[PDB]
């Protein structure tokens, strides 16, 4: 919504449609460190957000501000590298502006990745959590991407979200993750979105864990809400990149010397895995 109108999204789509030979079926948003997925694209066309008519431009990081269209493993992707975050200052409706364009691009599935703080103790840095569900800690407050008036053209005024993280794919994913049989389990849980750019206190993590979130991060929910609101099929992962929770003993803090997750290897794993799943995303035109 706000800020943009339909015609904006349309133009944006059109420009991109009339500027890349590619029809992406799938959109992929990479969280921190899952940038590299873009390498796996074949026949990549890169746009700086930059060049795209309405696309929010990045707030600093920038290069890690790119939209690359590509084929990933039997699918017409379009991936965002460096998704936008509220805490950078966009409101939700620039954050999620792309999801709306990908729709108009034709994309019918979105897969969203983030990095996220492990709050379930079951979890070990490097883990991948497949997102079963989320808690929208900003939307409850007003900070929801679909807030202001609703374009019937993209979706219903009150989309449901109980089915957000599409179930079929949660399966193929869980199957697939055993298909190549790796060994720590493919995790699964609720991602709670928390906005702020700073990291949580211990009390904060308590409340988050006791709300039954398993991962905390700051992205995705808005993209997922706006995805689902125009019916994209969605799923995605968090790369657990750290965890805290207990008062006795800050032999440490909550920060970024813990958001590598072993480094490349965890991240690389998620990337393969995503690249693999390409294969499970139902084709569109017909598929059978
Ligand atoms: N809030 C919060 N967000 C995060 C992490 C964390 O430890 N806490 C890691 C990645 N995103």
Return phi, psi of residue 121, to 5°. Answer: -75, -35
On whether 32 is known to bind a ligand per the annotation, the reply is yes
Give the Cα separation of 42 and 22 in Å (integer).
11
199 lines ligand 1 (CB under 6 A): yes
Q: Whose CA is nearest to atom 6 of ligand 1?
A: 117
Listing DSSP states for the chain in one string gives -TT--HHHHHHHHHHHHTT-S---SEEEEE-TT-GGGGGG-EEEEEEEGGGSTT----SS-BSB-EEEEEE-SSSEEEEEES---GGGT--HHHHSHHHHHHHHHT--EEEEEEEEEE-STT--TT-EEEEEEEEEHHHHHT--TT-SS--TTT--SS---TT-B-HHHHHHHHHHHHHTT-SS--EEEEEEE---SS---HHHHHHHHTTT-SEEESSSHHHHHHHHHTT-EEEEEEEEEEE---SS--SS-SSSTTSSSTTHHHHHHHHHHHHHHGGGS--SS---
Identify whether 218 is a catalytic site residue: yes
Q: Could you tell me if 187 and 128 are in contact, meaning their C-beta atoms sit under 8 angstroms apart?
A: yes
Solving technique: X-ray
221-229 and 97-105 helices cross at what angle (nearest 10)?
A: 40
User: Over the range 180-219, which residues count as b (16 or more CB within 10 Å of their CB) and which as e?
Assistant: eeeeeebbbbbbbbbeeeebbeeebbeebbeeebbbbbbb
Q: What is the resolution of this structure in A?
A: 2.8
Does 27 count as an annotated binding residue? no
- Going by CA atoms, what residue is nearest to atom 7 of ligand 1? 117
Taken in order of first residue, the domains within the chain and their CATH numbers are 1-288 (3.40.50.1580)
- Asked whether 120 lines ligand 1 (CB < 6 A), one says no
Q: Which of 101, 99, 91, 84 is nearest to 218 (CA)?
A: 84
Is the shortest distance between the CB of 216 and ligand 1 below 6 Å? yes
The Cα 76–Cα 14 span in angstroms is 17
Q: Are 48 and 66 in contact (CB under 8 A)?
A: yes
**Residue 63 is a catalytic residue:** yes
Cα 152 off chain centre by: 24
* Per-residue burial over 267-284, b = 16 or more CB atoms within 10 Å of its CB, e = otherwise: bebbbebbbbbbebbeee
CB atoms within 10 A of CB 73: 17
- What is the position in ligand 1's atom list of the atom closest to the CA of 218? 3
Q: How many Å lie between the centroid of ligand 1 and the Cα of residue 20?
A: 35
Q: Is the CB of 254 under 6 A from ligand 1?
A: yes
Separation of alpha carbons 35 and 27, rounded Å: 14
In whole angstroms, how large is the CA radius of gyration of the chain? Answer: 18
Residue to substitute in 195, 217, 237 for testing ligand 1 pocket (most ligand atoms within 8 angstroms of CB):
217
For residue 215, what are the β-bridge partners?
118, 191
Closest atom, ligand 1, to C-alpha of 255:
7
Report the alpha-carbon distance of residue 148 to residue 164 in Å, rounded. 21
Strand partners, 70: 77
**Which residue reads 């449901």 in tokens?**
160
Say whether 134 is catalytic: no
**Inter-CA distances, 63 with 5, 48, 67, 68, 168, Å:** 27, 8, 10, 12, 34
**What span, in angstroms and rounded, lies between the C-alpha atoms of 245 and 207?**
10
Tokens of 249: 């003993």
> Quick check: is 229 catalytic?
no
Task: Classify strands 42-48 and 66-71 as parallel, antiparallel or unpaired.
Answer: antiparallel
> Per the structure block, which two tokens stand in for 54?
């309405």
The answer to whether the beta carbons of residues 227 and 234 sit under 8 Å apart is yes
């Amino acid at each position: 919504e706000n800020g943009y109108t339909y015609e904006d999204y349309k133009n944006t789509a059109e420009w991109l449609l009339s500027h890349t030979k590619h029809r992406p079926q799938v959109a992929i948003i990479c969280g921190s460190g899952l940038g590299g997925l873009t390498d796996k694209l074949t026949q990549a066309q890169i746009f700086d957000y930059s060049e795209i008519p309405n696309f929010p431009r990045s707030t600093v990081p920038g290069h890690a501000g790119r939209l690359v269209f590509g084929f990933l493993n039997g699918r017409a992707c379009v991936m965002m590298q460096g998704r936008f975050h509220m805490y950078e200052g966009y409101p939700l409706w620039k954050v999620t502006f792309p999801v709306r364009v990908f729709h108009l691009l034709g994309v019918d599935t979105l897969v969203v990745t983030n990095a996220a703080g492990g709050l379930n103790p079951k979890f070990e840095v490097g883990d991948i959590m497949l997102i079963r569900d989320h808690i929208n800690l900003p939307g409850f407050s007003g900070q929801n991407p679909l807030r202001g008036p609703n374009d019937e053209r993209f979706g219903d005024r009150f989309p449901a979200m109980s089915d957000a993280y599409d179930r079929t794919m949660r399966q193929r994913a869980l199957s697939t993750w055993k298909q190549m049989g790796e060994q720590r389990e493919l995790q699964e849980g609720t991602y709670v979105m928390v906005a702020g750019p700073s990291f949580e206190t211990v009390a904060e993590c308590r409340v988050l864990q006791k709300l039954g979130a398993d991962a905390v991060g700051m992205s995705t929910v808005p993209e997922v809400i706006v995805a689902r609101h125009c019916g994209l099929r969605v799923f995605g992962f968090s790369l657990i990149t750290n965890k805290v929770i207990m008062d006795y003993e800050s032999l440490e803090k909550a920060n970024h010397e813990e958001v590598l997750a072993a480094g490349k290897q965890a991240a690389q794993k998620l990337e393969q895995f995503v690249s693999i799943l390409m294969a499970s995303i139902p084709l569109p035109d017909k598929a059978s």
